[PDB]
Design a protein around this ligand. Sequence first.
Ligand SMILES: O=c1nc[nH]c2c1ncn2[C@H]1C[C@H](O)[C@@H](COP(=O)(O)OP(=O)(O)OP(=O)(O)O)O1
Ligand SMILES: O=c1nc[nH]c2c1ncn2[C@H]1C[C@H](O)[C@@H](COP(=O)(O)OP(=O)(O)OP(=O)(O)O)O1
Ligand SMILES: [Zn+2]
Ligand SMILES: [Zn+2]
Lengths: 180, 180, 277, 277, 277, 277
Amino acid sequence: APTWFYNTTNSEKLRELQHVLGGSAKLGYLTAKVTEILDVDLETVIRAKAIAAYRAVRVPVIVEHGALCIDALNGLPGALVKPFWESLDTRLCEVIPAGQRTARARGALCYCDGRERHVLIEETEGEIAPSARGTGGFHWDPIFIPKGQTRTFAEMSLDEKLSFSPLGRLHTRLRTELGL
Amino acid sequence: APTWFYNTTNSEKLRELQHVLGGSAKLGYLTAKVTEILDVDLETVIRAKAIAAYRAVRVPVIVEHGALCIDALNGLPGALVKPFWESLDTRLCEVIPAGQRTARARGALCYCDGRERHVLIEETEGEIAPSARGTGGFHWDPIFIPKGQTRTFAEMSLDEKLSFSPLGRLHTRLRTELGL
Amino acid sequence: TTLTLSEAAPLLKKEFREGRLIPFLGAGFSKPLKLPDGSQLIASLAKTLGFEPELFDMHGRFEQLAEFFAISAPNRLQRLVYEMSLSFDSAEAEALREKSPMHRALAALDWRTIYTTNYDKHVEGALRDAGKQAAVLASFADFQGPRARDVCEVIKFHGTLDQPDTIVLTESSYFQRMALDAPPDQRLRADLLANSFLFIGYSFSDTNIRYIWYRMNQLREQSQLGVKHSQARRCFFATHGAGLVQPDILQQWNIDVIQLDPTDKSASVARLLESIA
Amino acid sequence: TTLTLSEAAPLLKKEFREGRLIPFLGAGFSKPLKLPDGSQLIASLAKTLGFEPELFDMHGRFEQLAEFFAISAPNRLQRLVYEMSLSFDSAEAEALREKSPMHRALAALDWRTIYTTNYDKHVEGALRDAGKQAAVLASFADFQGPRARDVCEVIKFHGTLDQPDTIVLTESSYFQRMALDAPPDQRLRADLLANSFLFIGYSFSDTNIRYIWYRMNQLREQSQLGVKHSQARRCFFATHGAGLVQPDILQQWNIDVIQLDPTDKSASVARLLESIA
Amino acid sequence: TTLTLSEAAPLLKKEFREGRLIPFLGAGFSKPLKLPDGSQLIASLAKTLGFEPELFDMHGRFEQLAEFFAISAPNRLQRLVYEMSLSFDSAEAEALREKSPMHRALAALDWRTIYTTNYDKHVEGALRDAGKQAAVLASFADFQGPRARDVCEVIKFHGTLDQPDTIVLTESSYFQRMALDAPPDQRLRADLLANSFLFIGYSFSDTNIRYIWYRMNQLREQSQLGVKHSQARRCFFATHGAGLVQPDILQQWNIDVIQLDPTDKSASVARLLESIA
Amino acid sequence: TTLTLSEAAPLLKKEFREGRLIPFLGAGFSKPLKLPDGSQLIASLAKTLGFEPELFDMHGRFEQLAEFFAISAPNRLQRLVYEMSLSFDSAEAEALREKSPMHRALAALDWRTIYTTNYDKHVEGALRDAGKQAAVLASFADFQGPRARDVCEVIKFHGTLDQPDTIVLTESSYFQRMALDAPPDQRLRADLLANSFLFIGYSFSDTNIRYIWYRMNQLREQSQLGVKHSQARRCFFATHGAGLVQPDILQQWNIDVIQLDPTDKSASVARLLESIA
Ligand SMILES: O=c1nc[nH]c2c1ncn2[C@H]1C[C@H](O)[C@@H](COP(=O)(O)OP(=O)(O)OP(=O)(O)O)O1
Ligand SMILES: O=c1nc[nH]c2c1ncn2[C@H]1C[C@H](O)[C@@H](COP(=O)(O)OP(=O)(O)OP(=O)(O)O)O1
Ligand SMILES: [Zn+2]
Ligand SMILES: [Zn+2]
């Protein structure tokens, strides 16, 4: 039986974390739906998301929340990235001026055992594409190009995306600190 | 002694609602700080704000939340207007293309007596200014020009701003439904 | 600090073959029958009173919101029992009960006493489905009534829907049971003197259940047994989602926690009841 | 459905001049002295145990989190009493107590019995500030000890910090008081037979206080008085923020709610105590 | 016949760099914190009992007057501990403790064991002020509790205020320690087998301390060592005002007297603790 | 709170005719023989050492000043015993002893065991004056020596002058008796198990006498007798000038105080010993 449970309602995040942390027999999976607080800071939202997901499932839980801070929007959306891609789908490439396309793709894991909340944060420098390209992946992957690379997260496979994305450095930090 | 309590931490909203509903002896004032949920819909946020403020003060409470839906940003920020003016102060006039500056200034009151939540919503058509002008008022008033008018909310006095703003139609609806 | 399923299985076989294991079934045992738990009742009481269900929840505890419901109008509690009877003991809840793996695994064992705190005929009804016969004991007239010789006695600890005077739901009915003078209270305290219990689908939120296990330790500590002998007779608490505080409170009362797999709640309970056989 | 301050003022004068009004003071009465209430204690217990204070709160009720604290290590409860003694009865809490308008207005009246459920010397200390003398009664040895002739007896209902065996904080200590056999329990039930009470700064969250007012109605209903005569002797519950459910539960127990002005909590209480004079 | 400060300084450096020097701190070490010594307690006990403080002093010794206090009324000793905790560990005694030169000079050294006979958190509190961490050991549960690896263990030899059962103040509690069976007694007698002690602010008036150094010589004399080798391991007794009889009694027990300058008591001790570094 | 002479006289007759009363005689019993008490010895030790007798008294207690005397020079304690022999057992102290009314009234009764803590042959010498015969028991060789069949055994509890190794005067000799292993210690603790004692002319200032009565209550309290039966066997303490603290300390140890008339000390004791007959 598992001792840690990764809670997400997003079935595309589920197949990413099962691609690397899938063979760990100490990790289970839950699908409880939580409501995030209104703040652009990633550290504040992921810390209030774990206390709201432990209250739902009542087991040691691991939650995940991201950020897409943009220099042209002075850090917007930040942790408000979920309603931007709902509203501005590929017009988000158009509302940003050409010449200052730089942005940061941040991502955070927070595991709560019922007594303590520990936040792990990784981060990837990049720049917003001039137009959306690529088919693979999911939300905002056709618009983000990492630094040095020419391609998007959507144009790369799941092994190649996790060699650039924040989750590929968060697998090893979550495995080491939890013994998965 | 009052029977209804208007809860806000914003001292500029306090002097607006005391300018019209101030002489009502049935209305008190509280300053409890609540945390909003992450959603662009104004109806969803103001309804979850009253249940979170009744839990704090435990009296019949009236809360207030607004929206600044913009056509060029497909409705963004919506009820996410609080972290935009923190991040983009007057660059918000610059991130929007000239020629499609139209926007809606929405505002909502929700009163909760402990058993029911009733939402009153008013709304003002307008357009974002090409640059911030005006000194009076507070957050995002130098950037919003109502339809027909040439001036901003910041350029107009408090009597003239409430003849255009959503709160000037929400005084009479709150007074009639509560008997203030 | 917490037993697993394979660790607790030889401990439950030993108490069962000696005839000293008694199941205690809660509201989570009728959850696969699509019945309300203690939270969906309050959502239904708030709809009748004109409350929003999230605003009604923050004015008091479960006992106190039902006390407020019962005194809102005359005959308001009688109507609730009628509505619960039509919903809890409906024919589609009967049909989900034969194909339920927990109720089949419960009735496959040859119990002698079963305690429940839920108002439905789905624990004795599970015994009728397996060809066995049961005897519901809820009031004083049931205990003095005629039974057969060797028949599993199902003790409806909080009452039955066909005897609406026995239902304890409101706060005043929980305070009336604090005297421990009701016939289900007197039968429970005598069975607790000699038997291990198995809590399935129940969470210790009732302050009269916790008060009975409190006062069994006042007999245990005053009898001045050793460290070895006062810890010999244990009770078992099968729960998917016990927190961090409650398992250590119950170690005082000789209650061990059996951690079940929370991914599938119904199959984890059914494997526990099949491991006793 | 709820008394105001001017409506309840002639009702409190009549019971006071007959000598049949007794104050019952809670944790909110020591809130202007910058002391913790029942929530800031749990925030301090969570810091010692290594919990975050928001995660520790969702594992049980107030009685159960203090029970978990006291059994975490040996002598863990004794340390808490020592820490509380230095924080609650400190010299800067003494200095805030002479200039407090509630404690001055309380001591200006010539009471004979005062009940408190808080662990601090600021109710009898308010009487010493006004030149009066008080008599703290908490344990069995205090009731049989010598007092003076006509001195206000302050009944520490939940215990005192200078007698750490009398403090009821954990869940096992609340269950030990359910027998209603302690000397503060026996004195309360006899004063409730003949006197009106005034609850100031107290919220009915203790299930042993609510159980005493429950069993006074079992004497009231069995005595078969009329509609007029069973509703004659009332108790009063001054509260800024009572909800929608709790005032109707307490109407069963002859407890009327006095709505105070929630804008300034300290001045609303002080105007109530000055209206009794 | 008596060491000075400069003579005893190289003798204390040698035992400290070998890790075989242990401080023993008395009631005079907390005198700059404006705390009572053994005489101002008796002046406070006489005020409670109704004695004049000069008449109460001539009816017995310090142990016997506190025994008379504790049996005057029930719960009279519990109140004293509560009052002592308010006055010894107050916030203004904390503020005098960071700017005290003795407590800074004590915590600047890297000790491993410190013994105290006073009831206050100002010896381990001095170690927390210097960024170091300490471990208070007073009862049996403290010795078997968890500590860290290399942390200075502060042995509260006469008890601590947060564990009121460990305080030895009355005559019956000194007689209970004559068996040398308490956990601070057993730890002291084993450390005395191998270590030099430094008595600071302590006067040998306790007949259980003097009895431990008595019975270490019964091991020393029965082992039949020479004149040279039985006098090798010394203990040190820093005192401003030792008389004419007591330094010669303690020469029997390998205790040397360090004469400190009596004009400024606090600065003389601080120069001794800085000379060890 | 204190027995008089006529009240205590029937209580002493009952224990004497049952053979369960044993006198315990102190230094005040030899005061009419013009002998030093514990204060005139120290005035004589201070003259030898070169002290003024008022300055020598303020450097320590009685045990500690004699310890300082004995280590001032070699053979300094042997000389003291020789000097005491010449002055305590002189021929003019013999002549005052036949005409003493206390020593005549003591020897008129038919005792079986007498305990003394003074170094003089005036208690067994009083028995030889009345024609009776006594048996002095001070050391191990005396207990195993030959006696007659029914002869009053005088137990020299602190030693005799004709056996100078048995005299306990210095502090190191009192600490050697704290083990309660000496033959007078073992005989006292067995007689205290079954007999009432009568303290005449003795004040409880010896911390080894007080420690024996302490540890008899540790047997008395652990045996869990009632309030009535643990207070049945009393001891008696005849004293002209007991203070206000010491009679209440000794009530713990079942020791009752007999107040004698302080105007004439010798005649008050003699009327007590004649009332036993
Ligand atoms: O690494 C990523 N690579 C591509 N897209 C990503 C990533 N990380 C988040 N995203 C998208 C998903 C979602 O549209 C939004 C985060 O919002 P988020 O609240 O976490 O998604 P959710 O509520 O549907 O699932 P969950 O219950 O786990 O929070 O940005
Ligand atoms: O009519 C308005 N005219 C000018 N500015 C306005 C208006 N209405 C909201 N605003 C600003 C204020 C705040 O910066 C944000 C709303 O966020 P909002 O959460 O309501 O403000 P808040 O938290 O500081 O006070 P409150 O406790 O009442 O929610 O947009
Ligand atoms: Zn989400
Ligand atoms: Zn806000």
